[PDB]
UniProtKB/Swiss-Prot annotation, chain B:
Sequence similarity: Belongs to the TRAFAC class translation factor GTPase superfamily. Classic translation factor GTPase family. EF-G/EF-2 subfamily.
Portion of the full sequence shown: 628 to 700 of 704
Species, as recorded: Escherichia coli (strain K12)
Domain of life: Bacteria
Modified residues (N6-acetyllysine): K16
Localization (cell): Cytoplasm
Transmembrane segments: none
Protein name per its UniProtKB record: Elongation factor G
General function of this protein: Catalyzes the GTP-dependent ribosomal translocation step during translation elongation. During this step, the ribosome changes from the pre-translocational (PRE) to the post-translocational (POST) state as the newly formed A-site-bound peptidyl-tRNA and P-site-bound deacylated tRNA move to the P and E sites, respectively. Catalyzes the coordinated movement of the two tRNA molecules, the mRNA and conformational changes in the ribosome.
UniProtKB/Swiss-Prot annotation, chain C:
Modified residue annotations for N-methylmethionine: M1
Pfam families: Ribosomal_L16
Annotated organism of origin: Escherichia coli (strain K12)
Family assignment from sequence similarity: Belongs to the universal ribosomal protein uL16 family.
Matches recorded under NCBIfam families: rplP_bact
Species classification: Bacteria, Pseudomonadati, Pseudomonadota, Gammaproteobacteria, Enterobacterales
Protein name: Large ribosomal subunit protein uL16
Subunit annotation: Part of the 50S ribosomal subunit. Cross-links to the A and P site tRNAs. Interacts with assembly factor DarP(YjgA).
Role description: Binds directly to 23S ribosomal RNA and is located at the A site of the peptidyltransferase center. It contacts the A and P site tRNAs. One of the last ribosomal proteins to be assembled in the 50S subunit. The simultaneous presence of uL16 and bL36 probably triggers ObgE's GTPase activity and eventual dissociation from the mature 50S ribosmal subunit. It has an essential role in subunit assembly.
From Swiss-Prot, chain D:
Record's subunit section: Part of the 50S ribosomal subunit.
Lineage: Bacteria, Pseudomonadati, Pseudomonadota, Gammaproteobacteria, Enterobacterales
Pfam families the record matches: Ribosomal_L36
GO cellular component terms listed in the entry, alphabetical order: cytoplasm; cytosolic large ribosomal subunit
Name under which the protein is recorded: Large ribosomal subunit protein bL36A
Swiss-Prot record, chain E:
Keyword Cytoplasm tagged: no
Oligomer status and interactors: Part of the 50S ribosomal subunit; part of the 5S rRNA/L5/L18/L25 subcomplex. Contacts the 5S rRNA.
Keyword terms of this UniProt record: Ribonucleoprotein, Ribosomal protein, RNA-binding, rRNA-binding
Family: Belongs to the bacterial ribosomal protein bL25 family.
Pfam hit, one: Ribosomal_L25p
UniProt name for this protein: Large ribosomal subunit protein bL25
RNA sequence: AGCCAGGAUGUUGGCUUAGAAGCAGCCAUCAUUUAAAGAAAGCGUAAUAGCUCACUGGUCGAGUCGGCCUGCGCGGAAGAU
């Protein structure tokens, strides 16, 4: 657990453990030998299913040992499939699709809690219902 | 890496991903044949002669509007 | 450029340009460009001043022009001795008096309104100011 | 150096000082912004 | 709710008025009623600083003069042409 | 205004996801506390990281910031016995 020098904050796919187009820059930057890192990735990758994006934080120690505290679906990627569609934005105020409730998202906020513990269960849900607004989705309960 | 990719993107290149081995940072991309013209003369002008590349064919993909309108004689 | 369609006469006496002006209040929109100096404005400077500030907002809001060239200023051709008749009219001016409301516009925010008038004023040979519509 | 009869503060770091009676603008970041005589 | 400090001007005229406005004070007039009008002089700086408000033109203006304070309304403002100052105000005694 | 702690960023947020991670710009302009924090200007940059900027957590301890109306001066201003 060092600083931000080797700290990379991005990943996308669990099941695709191979360096994907966005994890490319991330991997190459800190010379990450992903192959043996995939075996350590697949201990927790198997716990979650494929179809919901996963990020990672990367920590490299001083003695060339490099480790990680990977994730489960956080804020944006879970609320998207909660609406049913992964995208459909570029026009927040100019589009209006779907209506989602917060009590159902209060359950998936607890799934984000063990993943990316974002402050104040409903106020993080409000932070992320704005990501729904940013994704052109209406939310009412 | 960044420089090569900036120049790949510049030559309409699709930077794709940034891989790495031990002493090198490998980046594979797709580049038009029309902007292949004298590439290694411009490659080692930016990499101090320490880089290399190998061109392979993929497909006759889409030529954009500025590139489609050019060669019409 | 602006020019009188079908006026009565071809030429007009020179005439002094004294006194003050009548257009003083910002009577149509909210932000106007009152003139502080006393000269005259030909049609080419009239066209150029609007052009610079029309594209300053690029379409935005209504823009009114409160001055129109009436005086048909003539010039004599070169290598021609004095006399021999009044010369032909070359350009049309509008005599500007102190306290005259020039270009006026509306529908734009204030800070860019002062900016657009600043781009226009440097094209003018008269020192102007940025004035705002008061009540009554 | 630009001998421009008008001088505008062209950036954030561009400072305007009066050296030898003459108004001069210098910049810490961009040496293209140096100018005088305004 | 604005209050105006003022006083009665004497020896009026063209040059007399021009002599006033080059001394940071300007004339006015108060009329309206079964009485005679009142050519009142009032400070230039003070009322120009407060004419920006809309309540300067939508209120029974409380001008006090020689102790006697009256409630008037603002009829017209004959202002300066290009300088931001003003030349004259008409106060109808409402 | 500086100096140290920092920058209180959920959000690798869509999108065009090749990346546009506040940092291409269209947009929502949501929200976390409601002691220091805009879903963001700027070079820098392939894109992050970035140093900052907005704002000072606290250190010191006094006055201060920018326009307005104007008096008098500077620059703008180079010619031939």
């Amino acid at each position: 657990a060092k600083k931000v020098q080797a700290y990379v904050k991005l990943q996308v796919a669990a099941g695709m453990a191979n360096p994907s187009p966005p994890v490319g820059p991330a991997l190459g930057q800190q010379g990450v030998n992903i192959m043996e890192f995939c075996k350590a990735f697949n201990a927790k990758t198997d716990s979650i299913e494929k179809g919901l994006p996963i990020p990672v934080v990367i920590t490299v120690y001083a003695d060339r040992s490099f480790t990680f505290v990977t994730k489960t679906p956080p804020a944006a990627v879970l609320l998207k499939k909660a609406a049913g569609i992964k995208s459909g934005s570029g026009k927040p105020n100019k589009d209006k699709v779907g209506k989602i409730s917060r009590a159902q998202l209060q359950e998936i906020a607890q799934t984000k809690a063990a993943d990316m513990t974002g402050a104040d269960i409903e106020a993080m849900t409000r932070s992320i219902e704005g990501t729904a607004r940013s994704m052109g989705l209406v939310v009412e309960d | 890496t960044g420089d090569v990719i900036g120049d790949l993107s510049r030559r309409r290149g699709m930077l794709k991903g940034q891989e790495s081995e031990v002493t090198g940072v490998k980046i594979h991309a797709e580049v038009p044949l029309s902007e292949m013209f004298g590439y290694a003369t411009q490659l080692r002008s930016l990499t101090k002669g320490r880089a290399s590349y190998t061109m392979e064919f993929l497909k006759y993909d889409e030529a954009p509007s500025n590139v489609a309108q050019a060669v019409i004689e | 450029m602006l020019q009188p369609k079908r006026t009565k006469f071809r030429k007009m006496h020179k005439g002094r340009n004294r006194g003050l002006a009548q257009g003083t209040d910002v009577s149509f929109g909210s932000f106007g460009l009152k003139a502080v100096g006393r000269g005259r404005l030909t049609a080419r400077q009239i066209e150029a001043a609007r052009r610079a500030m029309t594209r300053a907002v690029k379409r935005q809001g209504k823009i009114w022009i409160r001055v129109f060239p009436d005086k048909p200023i003539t010039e004599k051709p070169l290598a021609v001795r004095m006399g021999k008749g009044k010369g032909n009219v070359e350009y049309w001016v509008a005599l500007i008096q102190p306290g005259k409301v020039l270009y006026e516009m509306d529908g734009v925010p204030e800070e860019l309104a002062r900016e657009a008038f600043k781009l226009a004023a440097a094209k003018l040979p008269i020192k102007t100011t940025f004035v705002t519509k008061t009540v009554m | 150096m630009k001998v421009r009869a008008s001088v505008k503060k062209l950036c954030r770091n561009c400072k305007i000082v009066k050296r030898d009676g003459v108004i001069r603008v210098i910049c810490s970041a961009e040496p293209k912004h140096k100018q005088r005589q305004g | 709710m604005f209050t105006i400090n003022a006083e009665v001007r004497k020896e009026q005229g063209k040059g007399a008025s021009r002599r006033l406005r080059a001394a940071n004070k300007f004339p006015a007039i108060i009329y309206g009623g079964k009485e005679a009008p009142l050519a009142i002089e009032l400070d230039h700086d003070k009322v120009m600083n407060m004419q920006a408000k809309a309540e300067f033109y939508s209120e029974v203006l409380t001008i006090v003069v020689d102790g006697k304070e009256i409630k008037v309304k603002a009829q017209d403002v004959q202002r300066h042409p290009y300088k931001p100052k003003l030349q004259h105000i008409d106060f109808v005694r409402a």
